[PDB]
Design a protein around this nucleic acid. Structure first.
Ligand SMILES: Nc1ncnc2c1ncn2[C@@H]1O[C@H](CSCC[C@H](N)C(=O)O)[C@@H](O)[C@H]1O
Ligand code: NI
Length: 454
RNA sequence: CCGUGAAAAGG
């Protein structure tokens, strides 16, 4: 039978969720990276069980017409750009296909129109944030990205999909951590000082926050290292320290300190100014977030008398960008630093009709139900894991006739939609947006609508 | 799920 690195000619017939190539081999399904439909490869088997297997391209016999390369002294996987070998138009078609397929396979919904993916004019160098691990590799302190399904660091200077300024700051920081001989983190030995570098840069403002993620409070010569980097990049207005002392894959720990300047940067979205703290979420592709937000606004058909609840509000980018053309905005957030951004961001743009709280989304709804606040619309933008049942049910009991659900994960979105249908919400429209070009990730906005009156 | 373009291990 087929066993580890036997060699076999196969033809790819489809692309998985992750963008891996599917091949059939004598009853078995094989998954293989950097192989597009139509391509014929010699395939070396990596592992094979009963049913499923994994394979690697030994040689390309015939390459797809849709392959990029061409481009270009790769950029070869790394982890960053797992759809980068695909031309950009086929990326869009793939993401549209992924939304239809999940809607059907999980929600059971065959009967809805899924618009084609709204692509990016220049789908490169788009990321306003870099979270870079710092490790010891072949003697030397290195910045880079983990290989898929590993914590094997691949040294890197060019990151392809990042704002190129962020790239330079990371390389400058790397050169300064070598020269001041600061000690990189080691996961196994549980030793060292420098765990991660985080660099965020305003898309419109150009203001940079640097975060040093470290295992301990004390960093020898930190002020001298700040002074050097601030000389090279005078757009740096914030240098912060995060202390993460735990054996965990979470990048950030509990404690934050300001080593230099402010503990926020300012950026603009939709002509409103927003202050952004280090641990607050901010969409990593601003240009496309602006179209995603606009899309959500147009789906929701707001009027001057509407009362919006902004669940999972963050720093209130959605909330406050609708606040001018509605009656009231009510927002719930998880982490204080972001709510205090919210209240300050309201103040900053002279918005009196937006009301933020700290809480879980469920409780603020419970409090708002008892308080007598009657919302017309619900805007939710949850993380990858989606919504909880408890939130879905509490949201459906407000009588809100419209729900705009913004999602960065179709799997959970669909599950959540299926629930909302059993509580009298019909899925009216769905619009994928390409927030993460060259990756398998897809951003969607779905509009949900009250039929029943209950 | 902790867990955030990648994100082992361990819960
Ligand atoms: N159960 C819950 N209740 C309220 N907020 C939550 C939550 N779970 C996660 N969150 C928060 O919801 C946010 C999702 S990110 C959405 C923020 C917004 N689009 C922006 O651009 O700023 C995160 O900040 C997260 O901390
Ligand atoms: Ni995925």
């Amino acid at each position: 039978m087929l066993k580890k690195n036997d060699i076999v000619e196969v033809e790819i017939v489809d692309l998985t969720h992750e963008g891996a190539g599917v091949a059939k081999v004598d009853g078995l399904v094989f998954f293989v990276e950097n192989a597009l439909p139509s391509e014929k490869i010699l395939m070396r088997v990596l592992k094979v069980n009963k049913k499923i297997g994994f394979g690697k391209v030994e040689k390309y016999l015939v390459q797809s017409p849709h392959r990029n390369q061409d481009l270009d002294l790769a950029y070869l996987r790394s982890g960053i750009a797992d759809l980068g070998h695909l031309s950009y138009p086929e990326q869009l078609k793939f993401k549209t296909k992924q939304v239809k397929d999940s809607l059907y396979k999980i929600a059971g919904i065959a009967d809805v129109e899924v618009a084609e993916t709204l692509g990016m004019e220049h789908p490169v160098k788009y990321r306003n944030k870099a979270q870079v691990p710092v490790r010891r590799v072949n003697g030397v302190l290195e910045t880079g990205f983990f290989r898929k399904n590993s914590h094997n660091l691949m040294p890197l200077e060019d990151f392809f999909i990042q704002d190129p300024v962020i790239d330079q700051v990371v390389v400058a920081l790397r050169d300064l951590l070598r020269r001041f001989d600061l000690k990189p983190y080691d996961e196994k030995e549980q030793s060292g000082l420098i765990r991660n570098l985080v660099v965020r840069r305003g898309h419109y403002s150009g203001q940079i926050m640097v975060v040093l993620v470290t295992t301990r409070p004390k960093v020898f010569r930190v002020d001298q290292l700040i002074e050097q980097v601030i000389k090279q990049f005078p757009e740096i207005v914030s240098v912060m320290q995060n202390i993460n002392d735990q054996n965990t894959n979470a990048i950030f720990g509990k404690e934050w300190r300001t080593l230099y300047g402010q503990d926020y940067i300012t950026d603009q979205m939709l002509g409103n100014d927003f202050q952004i703290a280090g641990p607050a979420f901010y969409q990593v592709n601003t240009e496309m977030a602006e179209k995603l937000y606009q899309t959500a606004i147009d789906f929701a058909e707001l009027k001057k008398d509407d009362v919006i609840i902004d669940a999972y509000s963050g720093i209130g980018t959605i909330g406050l960008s609708v606040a001018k053309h509605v009656k009231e905005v009510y927002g719930v957030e998880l982490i204080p630093e972001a709510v205090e951004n919210s209240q300050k961001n309201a103040s900053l743009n002279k918005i009196t009709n937006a009301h933020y709280v700290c809480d879980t989304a469920e409780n603020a709804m419970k409090k708002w139900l008892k308080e007598g606040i009657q919302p017309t619309v619900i805007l939710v933008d949850p993380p990858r894991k989606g919504l909880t049942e408890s939130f879905i049910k509490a949201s459906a009991q407000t009588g809100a006739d419209r729900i705009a659900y913004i999602s960065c994960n179709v799997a959970t979105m669909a599950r959540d939609i299926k629930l909302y249908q059993e509580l009298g919400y019909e899925l009216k429209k769905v619009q994928p947006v390409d927030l993460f070009p060259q990756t398998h990730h897809v951003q969607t906005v779905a509009l949900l609508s009250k039929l029943d009156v209950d």
